[PDB]
């Protein structure tokens with residue numbers, strides 16, 4: 001049934017931007033642990049993540065944490081589209097910036113610690 | 116005279132050195148020192164008899180307020196309260212500089228006539244925080 005879409009669900013890892021697939025799916029998606037993959041999401045947004053391999057998760061369930069879900073707007077039980085991107089290209093100093101009106105105890109050089 | 120006597124107390128113009136006797140505590144402020152800024156007191160200094168009530172300045176907080184010296188016999192609980200409420204009262208910005216939950220409610224249980232409101236007022240005066248009574 002057009003096996004491009006896939007459901008999202010919880011992840012065990014503490015790190016960000018890591019999707020754990022169900023092992024029986026290696027060569028159908030054709031991407032190994034060294035390939036980053038693009039995942040679609042509502043209001044026309046996307047993300048890209050490296051992938052891990054595990055046994056316990058179900059076939060139809062990606063595992064991914066809150067930070068990588070919110071920007072996709074994907075809420076658990078919702079379905080997103082997964083497509084390999086071996087065409088990855090490095091960047092040169094992506095511009096990164098704090099969010100919100102203010103940060104508690106924030107001053108000085110926060111980049112050598114938080115980045 | 117008895118207090119300056121056998122003392123040679125160091126003294127600078129403006130200090131509030133307190134004297135105690137006749138079952139009352141009075142403090143005399145030195146307003147003028149012939150040499151400056153400070154001096155020792157000597158038995159050979161003639162003495163001046165004025166005794167006039169100049170009213171105290173508004174900004175200074177009187178010595179009437181209670182301090183830790185007025186409370187004895189509850190050292191452990193007083194130390195606990197001090198270590199518990201020193202940071203929030205005197206270092207408010209820090210608690211905004213870190214994510215932690217300070218206490219905002221304390222109960223004191225004991226028989227009447229033990230100095231609970233006395234302890235509260237002493238802490239309030241010793242940390243300079245505003246005090247409200249209900």
Ligand SMILES: Nc1ncnc2c1ncn2[C@@H]1O[C@H](COP(=O)(O)OP(=O)(O)O)[C@@H](O)[C@H]1O
Pocket residue numbers: 185186187188189226227228229230231232233
């Ligand atoms: N270290 C002390 N411990 C207990 N009581 C004291 C101490 N020093 C003075 N007092 C006495 O405590 C009385 C005031 O206590 P009070 O405020 O009525 O306590 P409570 O509010 O618990 O009844 C004063 O009359 C004072 O003489």
